[PDB]
Amino acid sequence: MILPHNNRQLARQYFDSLPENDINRKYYEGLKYETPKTFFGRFLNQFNIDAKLDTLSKFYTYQKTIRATQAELQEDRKSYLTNSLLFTAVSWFSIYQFARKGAVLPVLREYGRYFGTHRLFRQYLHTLVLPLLYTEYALNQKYYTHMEHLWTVHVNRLNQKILEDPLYTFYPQELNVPKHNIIVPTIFRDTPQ
């Protein structure tokens, strides 16, 4: 949508500013990216989503899809974190009240096998940890394929050496070119015919 002369090549500027030995530099040189196909490879890549999103944002800032993905991921992180914290707080409050009244849920061994930690303490630990792990797993599963597709597009662009801003990029007002609203219609003349 942006004409070649109206493109600011912010992606190219960031690529130039990047260091000498960089993964983006290697991709531009011609390094090809392939998503992992093994379970271990996918599990390892699961933790690289944040870095990929950050670098893609730095490269193609103001890109519609990248900006929408960032906003959605931030909102999902906030919502999942608050839900997990509320669940943990409610569970801890319930456990404390029922233990005060003398009722303890018969979950987990009463005493630890090695350190002899009490069932109440281990229940608190599980209530604190399990929801966080579930939140992380859910977010990673939700965003992994999208992040991989975005990264594949970025790597293909680097290999093709297309460092210009992609489609659906909307620059701020400072970089937006003013529109000429002065139009002078041509003088009317009777047709010779």
Partner: protein, 247 residues
């Protein structure tokens, strides 16, 4: 293109109270054999409150329909810099007027059955017991009004049975095909396969962006080609301006 199709997802919720009333009336009728007047006053009062609610809804809709015909607008006189209220007549498709008359008749019938129910409840309160004749008459009035409540759903019948009318005669030799029963027996199999795939095979996800504004207002570009409606240039400009404002 003026098909006038109303959403069933919106129609069913509106229709719920009437079916609730008729079901409660049937339960009251069935239970009248072994129940007393005092105990069944609960059901009677529930039916009365539901009928009042439906009466309010019907009156509100009827008032809107009747007030349509009075076109009142504000006109700004620039010389005096003053807004003035002006009244004018209405011009619209005659189908709207016909359905408005039908809805007026429906509202009058509902007022009639509401008065019938009020009379019945007052009389049973005075007597001290309920009677099958009047109770069943009220139940059947509720059923009839429920049937009549579907008056404004005739566009779906037209949409279904006009494509049958437009079919020409077989031997006039326009297409030389008749696939009614064939399509019936083929759609049986197609629906079987579709349901089996839906509840046992891959189902595409429904996840979508819920936060970024105007994300799905996709302006034309190379990816989407330029075969859109011609005057969507303004739409594309507005989308561009909105994206600039967001960013």
């Amino acid at each position: 293109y003026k098909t006038h199709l109303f959403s069933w997802r919106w129609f069913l919720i509106k229709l719920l109270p009437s079916v609730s009333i008729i079901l409660l009336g049937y339960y009251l009728q069935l239970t009248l054999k072994w129940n007393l007047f005092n105990k069944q006053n609960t059901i009677v009062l529930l039916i009365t409150l539901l009928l009042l609610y439906i009466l309010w809804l019907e009156f509100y809709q009827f008032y809107h329909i009747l007030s349509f015909y009075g076109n009142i607008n504000w006109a700004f006189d620039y010389d005096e810099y003053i807004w003035t209220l002006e009244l004018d007549t209405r011009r619209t498709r005659l189908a709207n007027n016909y359905i408005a008359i039908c809805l007026f008749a429906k509202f009058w019938h509902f007022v009639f059955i509401f008065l019938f129910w009020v009379f019945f409840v007052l009389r049973i309160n005075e007597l001290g017991r309920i009677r099958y004749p009047l109770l069943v008459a009220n139940v059947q009035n509720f059923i009839i009004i429920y049937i009549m409540s579907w008056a404004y759903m005739y566009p779906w019948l037209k949409f279904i049975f006009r494509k049958y009318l437009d079919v020409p005669y077989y031997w006039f030799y326009l297409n030389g095909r008749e696939l009614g029963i064939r399509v019936f027996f083929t759609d049986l199999k197609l629906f079987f396969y579709g349901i089996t795939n839906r509840l046992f095979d891959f189902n595409p996800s429904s996840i979508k962006f819920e936060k970024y504004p105007f994300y799905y207002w996709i302006n034309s570009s190379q990816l989407t080609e330029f075969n859109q409606y011609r005057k969507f240039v303004i739409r594309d400009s507005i989308i561009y301006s909105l994206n600039n404002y967001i960013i």
